[PDB]
Amino acid sequence: EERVYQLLPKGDVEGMRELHQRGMSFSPYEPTGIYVKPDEEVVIQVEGTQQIKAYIGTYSYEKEGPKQFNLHPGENKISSSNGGLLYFYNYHNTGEVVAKVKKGGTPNPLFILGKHTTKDWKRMLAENPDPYAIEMKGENSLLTMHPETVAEHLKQEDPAALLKKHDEIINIEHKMSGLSKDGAGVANQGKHSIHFVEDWYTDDYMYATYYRTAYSKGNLESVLNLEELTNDGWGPWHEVGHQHQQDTWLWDGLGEVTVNIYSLAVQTTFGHKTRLEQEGRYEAAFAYLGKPDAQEKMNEFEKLVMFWQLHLAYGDQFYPNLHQMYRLLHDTELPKSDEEKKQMFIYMTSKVAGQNLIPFFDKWGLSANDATREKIEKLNLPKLEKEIWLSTDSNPIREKQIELYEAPYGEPNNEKIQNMVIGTTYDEEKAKELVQNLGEGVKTTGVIMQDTPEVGEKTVKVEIVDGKGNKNFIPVVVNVGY
Ligand code: NI
């Protein structure tokens, strides 16, 4: 009756979040399929050297949030007044960690894509009738659902096809973010999945926040019905989009705008006409072209037009390259205000495009200041040849297709998780030893950056450069001290 988990090293959700410049973390959960009752003591044994974290409870599934646990190697006795599902968090980057649940707890359906069969699923449901929850785990996704809700909306013999679709969507949004499984540094999507939670304790419709996206009662059809997710899945696409938004070009007014760049990505990828096109949002937005107050007048879907136009105009690679370029910014060049984010966006997009985009932004009433004009002027980029502010999906206006940014490769070095005096931004020698297996032509620059300077043992970013002059930041764990 001992249940053993081989917890892979996943790294830190907060780490990833900061490296990505995203507003909220991905899920830290590795599910166990073990429900633990209120006040039930669970005996769990951690083998090997490394310590890990654990949770009793599921974010957004109960009224009260999950209780959290630090597991020292050897024997532990954890317990929650509220009970809940058990999850493990091997937040380290190196070393698999074996955790054994010796006593306490009871089985709860957990279906893992690529591990379980239709037979296992059927058996699972029959053996654990009317359980606390249903959990379904894909490569990139986790679903924590009420059982009556799965029984109503799952239209397949097993959850496999559904998980594959959810993973497909998540990967599309990762891709749009210039983030991949293999990529190093600013291209690394990280090892954490996206969590979808049926939340019976909110009046909100759907929402996204740290660790998970959640869906209030009666609103789960497009998360659980494969055809609805595929064909009419805006809600979940959008909430996943929120977890993807990067704050560095998220000024006031864009919170409910840029999220839908990801949604439109999924929507067009699945072969559907854009919500923009269906809602006549283009013609509605064009009524403001050349009007100076356009940004104050346009609604959130109107403003979405401009952003999507750049996608149509340059490549599927536009937003992938834009995301990465923003992640390469040094501390002093991170935009500190709404106005700065705006001036920065005009500059950064022009560089990704390799064209002076000012006339385009001018049309949308996003005015470059003279500093931004001159700064783009010094780039000697060709002018816009077409009128891309008039672009629609049905009549797209395309400039040159741009290729994907090739980020230089490099790795951390955990040999010696090392010492650093806080606020160091350049150490030629230390930098060379924080990284390893760099690529060809590639070398450290000496630049070192800590996004939120805290003390002790946190991820710092080590800058690298290749023969071309393309940069990357490699995250590594360090001791930061006085
Ligand atoms: Ni939203």
DSSP string, 274-320: PHHHHTTHHHHHHTTTT-TTHHHH--HHHHHHHHHHHHHHH-TTHHH
Query: Any idea of the CA torsion for 89, 167, 263, 22, to the nearest 10 degrees?
Result: 20
d(CA 394, CA 391): 8
> How many Å lie between the centroid of ligand 1 and the Cα of residue 240?
9
Nearest alpha-carbon partner for 20 in 202, 132, 145, 188:
188
> How many Å lie between the centroid of ligand 1 and the Cα of residue 247?
15
Are 221 and 252 found together in one domain? Answer: no
Q: Assign residue 408 a region: left if phi > 0, alpha if psi is -120 to 50, beta otherwise?
A: beta
> How many Å lie between the centroid of ligand 1 and the Cα of residue 254?
10
Residue with tokens 């097993």: 158
Residue 299: how many other CB atoms lie within 10 Å: 12
Are 42 and 101 found together in one domain? Answer: yes
CA angle 360-320-208, nearest 5°?
100
Cα dihedral sign, 21-59-190-256: negative
> How many Å lie between the centroid of ligand 1 and the Cα of residue 452?
26
Are 394 and 260 found together in one domain? Answer: yes
> 9 and 96 in contact (C-beta within 8 Å)?
yes
d(CA 443, CA 58): 43
CATH of the domain at 187: 3.40.390.80
> 187 and 255 in contact (C-beta within 8 Å)?
no
> How many Å lie between the centroid of ligand 1 and the Cα of residue 257?
8
C-alpha 28, offset from chain centre: 12
> How many Å lie between the centroid of ligand 1 and the Cα of residue 275?
15
| Token pair of 232 as six digits | 């009419």
Nearest alpha-carbon partner for 79 in 133, 35, 31, 38:
38
Give residues after which the chain gaps, C-N over 2.5 angstroms: none
Are 349 and 220 found together in one domain? Answer: no
Amino acid present at 63: K
Report the 3 state secondary structure along 43-59.
EEEECCCCCEEEEECCC
Amino acid present at 131: P
> How many Å lie between the centroid of ligand 1 and the Cα of residue 34?
32
> How many Å lie between the centroid of ligand 1 and the Cα of residue 245?
11
Are 400 and 253 found together in one domain? Answer: yes
> How many Å lie between the centroid of ligand 1 and the Cα of residue 208?
8
> 146 and 134 in contact (C-beta within 8 Å)?
yes
> 370 and 330 in contact (C-beta within 8 Å)?
no
> How many Å lie between the centroid of ligand 1 and the Cα of residue 298?
17
> How many Å lie between the centroid of ligand 1 and the Cα of residue 471?
33
Residue 188 three-state SS:
strand
What H or E segment, with its residue span, contains residue 344? helix 338-353
> How many Å lie between the centroid of ligand 1 and the Cα of residue 144?
20
The Cα-based distances of 13 to 19, 193, 345 in angstroms read 10, 10, 27
> 29 and 215 in contact (C-beta within 8 Å)?
no
The Cα-based distances of 72 to 49, 69, 85 in angstroms read 9, 10, 20
Report the DSSP pairing between strands 84-89 and 52-56: antiparallel
CATH of the domain at 438: 2.60.40.3600
Longest dimension (CA), the chain: 71
Q: What is the DSSP letter of 178?
A: T
> How many Å lie between the centroid of ligand 1 and the Cα of residue 277?
20
d(CA 355, CA 305): 19
> How many Å lie between the centroid of ligand 1 and the Cα of residue 267?
16
Nearby residues of 9 by Cβ (< 8 Å), 6 or more positions away: 90, 92, 93, 94, 95, 96, 97, 191
Task: Please identify, among 109, 130, 159, the residue that sits at the C-terminal boundary of a domain.
Answer: 109
Phi, psi of 247 (to 5 degrees): -70, -20
> How many Å lie between the centroid of ligand 1 and the Cα of residue 248?
18
Amino acid present at 256: E
d(CA 19, CA 208): 19
CA angle 37-108-140, nearest 5°?
120
Q: Quick one: angle between helices 370-377 and 338-353, nearest 10?
A: 20
d(CA 153, CA 217): 13
> How many Å lie between the centroid of ligand 1 and the Cα of residue 342?
21
d(CA 236, CA 229): 8
> How many Å lie between the centroid of ligand 1 and the Cα of residue 181?
26
Residue 150: how many other CB atoms lie within 10 Å: 22
d(CA 416, CA 355): 45
> How many Å lie between the centroid of ligand 1 and the Cα of residue 187?
25
> How many Å lie between the centroid of ligand 1 and the Cα of residue 238?
6
Task: Please identify, among 109, 128, 149, the residue that sits at the C-terminal boundary of a domain.
Answer: 109
Are 365 and 295 found together in one domain? Answer: yes
> 211 and 251 in contact (C-beta within 8 Å)?
no
Residues forming beta bridges with residue 110, ordered by sequence position: 135
CATH of the domain at 352: 1.10.390.30
> How many Å lie between the centroid of ligand 1 and the Cα of residue 413?
39
CA angle 475-480-481, nearest 5°?
170
d(CA 292, CA 173): 33
Are 148 and 197 found together in one domain? Answer: yes
CA angle 257-309-262, nearest 5°?
45
Are 201 and 296 found together in one domain? Answer: no
Residue 200: how many other CB atoms lie within 10 Å: 14
d(CA 61, CA 196): 10
> How many Å lie between the centroid of ligand 1 and the Cα of residue 264?
14
> How many Å lie between the centroid of ligand 1 and the Cα of residue 234?
10
Are 354 and 441 found together in one domain? Answer: no
d(CA 44, CA 74): 8
> How many Å lie between the centroid of ligand 1 and the Cα of residue 260?
8
Are 237 and 306 found together in one domain? Answer: no
> 14 and 28 in contact (C-beta within 8 Å)?
no
Total number of domains constituting the chain: 4
Are 393 and 409 found together in one domain? Answer: no
Nearby residues of 269 by Cβ (< 8 Å), 6 or more positions away: 172
> How many Å lie between the centroid of ligand 1 and the Cα of residue 138?
24
Residue with tokens 């800590």: 450
> How many Å lie between the centroid of ligand 1 and the Cα of residue 235?
8
Q: What is the DSSP letter of 393?
A: S
What does the chain come to in residues?
482
d(CA 252, CA 383): 29
What H or E segment, with its residue span, contains residue 87? strand 84-89
What H or E segment, with its residue span, contains residue 111? strand 110-112
Are 3 and 96 found together in one domain? Answer: yes
d(CA 219, CA 229): 12
Residue 103 three-state SS:
strand
> 163 and 134 in contact (C-beta within 8 Å)?
no
d(CA 472, CA 185): 6
Residue 123 three-state SS:
helix
What H or E segment, with its residue span, contains residue 362? helix 358-363
| Token pair of 404 as six digits | 């994907």
d(CA 243, CA 209): 7
d(CA 127, CA 116): 15
Resolution (A): 2.1
What H or E segment, with its residue span, contains residue 265? helix 259-269
> How many Å lie between the centroid of ligand 1 and the Cα of residue 440?
42
Nearest alpha-carbon partner for 149 in 245, 218, 236:
218
Task: Please identify, among 218, 244, 270, the residue that sits at the C-terminal boundary of a domain.
Answer: 244
| Token pair of 278 as six digits | 């269906």
> How many Å lie between the centroid of ligand 1 and the Cα of residue 148?
27
Phi, psi of 176 (to 5 degrees): -60, -30
C-alpha 153, offset from chain centre: 26
d(CA 264, CA 266): 5
d(CA 143, CA 116): 15
Q: Quick one: angle between helices 318-327 and 300-314, nearest 10?
A: 100
**What's the Rg (C-alpha) of the chain?**
24
Nearby residues of 298 by Cβ (< 8 Å), 6 or more positions away: 285, 288
- For residue 135, the enclosing domain spans 110-244
